């Protein structure tokens, strides 16, 4: 029902929340963009963090009974609760009304949540380049050009990095108006 029946260990949830937190924590443009979006679907938890420009999603496997619900809960409070609870504590979160109940062995919390229908989601788009790549190659591609990027330049296009897909190679380009860095692999 309303309870998005949810039950996971901390060891499999601390790192995903740490990744999903991202830019959240500060003052948001809209009051909802400080709440992680929790979704339950097909035996999987989806953690979502949005900044109206960036969208970080983490998937956690569910090996315990669950219910398909979704809601947005303050990110910092939920993360502080999650790491506060002891090692190996099987978090069990359910929902009722507009409050979700977090539970562990001999401990209970109640958190105020907002509906998932209001949380922004970046619209689906058609993709032209489906690209797969090893980790270290991307690491070097970024690290070899990140220094040459602009620093809050009045020219928007100077800020950021250029990705070029040409034939069998991928290229990273960076410029600040005086330097150019190119890395093609």
């Amino acid at each position: 029902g309303p309870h998005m029946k949810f039950t996971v260990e901390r060891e499999h949830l601390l790192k995903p929340l740490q990744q999903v937190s991202g830019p959240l924590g500060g003052r948001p443009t809209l009051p909802i963009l400080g709440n992680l979006l929790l979704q339950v679907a097909d035996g999987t938890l989806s953690l979502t963090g949005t900044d109206l420009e960036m969208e970080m999603v983490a998937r956690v496997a569910l090996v315990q009974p669950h219910e398909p619900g979704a809601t947005t809960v303050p990110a910092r409070k939920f993360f502080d609760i999650c790491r506060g609870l002891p090692e190996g504590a099987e978090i069990a979160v359910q929902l009722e009304g507009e409050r979700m109940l977090v539970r562990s062995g001999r401990s209970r919390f109640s958190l105020s949540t907002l509906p998932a229908a209001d949380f922004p989601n970046l619209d689906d788009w058609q993709s032209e380049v489906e690209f797969t790549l090893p980790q270290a190659t991307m690491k070097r591609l970024i690290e070899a050009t990140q220094f040459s990027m602009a620093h809050q330049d009045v020219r928007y296009y100077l800020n950021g990095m250029l990705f070029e897909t040409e034939g069998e190679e991928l290229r990273t380009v960076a410029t600040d108006g005086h330097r150019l860095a190119v890395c093609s692999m």
Binding site: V154, G177, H178, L180
Partner: protein
């Protein structure tokens, strides 16, 4: 350097571009249009990359020097811009301006924008080193006696037909407000693509924005124009001007008037004017005022001015603007009552 009004700037820009352009004056609109024209002409001759800086005690001069000396991967032909502060080239800024005057090159074009420079105070060094091969552009707000022909010229160059009535209405609502005046002409062109502006057309779509300085108020008092002085006083009230500045500005000329009227019994006003070092345009209006109900308003008005001064400088609730209205009405051949004068 070549000293120039905005009229011939285009022509000069067509002749050639100098090392540095100094856009100076108290008019935002004239400075802005001159800067836009300079940047467009520079872009025509390849000056593609632009930059901006605000000359401030907290500015990063090293960035300016680095970008002026070094060149970019693209658009080598570069231009640079600096906003001078309200006071001007501060004594802590003249030396670094001199360094820029050494750190220049034929590739870069420097644009200098700010208020008018007190040449009597600041000259030579930076000024002459630019004067070598530079342009000075004076962009100052046309005064009341000069604004109507400026507005007529602007209407002619924007393809509008302004009669005398619309011209004087526009010159009434917008003084020291040439930016909003140009915007008003643009809005009137937008409202009617006919391009023919009459009295009601401008009268409907106009606001009494204006911008006056206490000198305008004192001049209006000396000419004895009741409506003009009261409009100026209301405008400085709405603008938020400090009334004590008004008090001092009026007091200087009022005590000068008292001295002149007292000494005029032994000396003609010409030699008195020469004694006090007062200028010719000031001389005409002060001579007009000195023989306009004097020797009674010059002590009664000093009494009222002292009343306003003490009331302003004891409490903190002010409420002196009505008393300033009393002064505005006393010095304009409209005698007041002793009840309000004495208090």
């Amino acid at each position: 350097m070549i000293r120039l009004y905005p009229e011939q700037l285009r022509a000069q820009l067509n002749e050639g571009l100098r090392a540095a352009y100094l856009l100076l004056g108290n008019d935002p609109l004239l400075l802005q249009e001159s800067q836009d024209a300079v940047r467009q002409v520079a872009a025509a001759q390849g000056f593609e990359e632009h930059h901006t800086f605000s000359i401030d005690p907290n500015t990063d001069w090293n960035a300016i020097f680095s970008l002026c000396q070094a060149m970019s991967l693209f658009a080598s032909r570069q231009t640079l811009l600096l906003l001078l502060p309200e006071n001007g080239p501060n004594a802590a800024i003249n030396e670094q301006l001199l360094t820029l005057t050494g750190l220049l090159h034929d590739d870069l074009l420097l644009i200098v924008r700010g208020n008018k420079l007190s040449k009597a105070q600041e000259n030579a060094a930076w000024f002459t080193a630019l004067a070598n091969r530079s342009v000075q552009v004076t962009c100052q707000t046309p005064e009341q006696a000069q604004l109507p022909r400026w507005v007529a010229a602007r209407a002619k160059q924007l393809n509008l037909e302004l009669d005398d009535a619309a011209n004087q209405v526009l010159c009434y609502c917008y003084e020291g407000n040439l930016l909003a005046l140009a915007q008003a002409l643009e809005r009137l062109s937008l409202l009617w693509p006919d391009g023919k502006l009459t009295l009601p057309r401008v009268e409907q779509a106009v606001n009494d924005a204006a911008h006056f300085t206490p000198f305008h108020w004192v001049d209006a008092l000396l000419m004895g124009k009741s409506k003009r002085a009261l409009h100026i006083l209301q405008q400085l009230r709405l603008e938020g001007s400090e009334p004590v500045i008004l008090l001092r500005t009026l007091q200087r000329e009022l005590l000068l008037l008292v001295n002149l009227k007292r000494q005029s019994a032994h000396t003609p006003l010409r030699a008195l004017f020469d004694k006090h070092r007062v200028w010719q345009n000031r001389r005409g209006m002060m001579g007009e005022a000195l023989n306009r109900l004097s020797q009674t308003q010059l002590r009664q008005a000093v009494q009222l001015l002292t009343r306003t001064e003490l009331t302003l400088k004891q409490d903190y609730g002010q409420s002196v603007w009505a008393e300033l209205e009393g002064l505005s009405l006393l010095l304009c051949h409209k005698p007041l009552a002793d009840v309000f004068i004495d208090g």
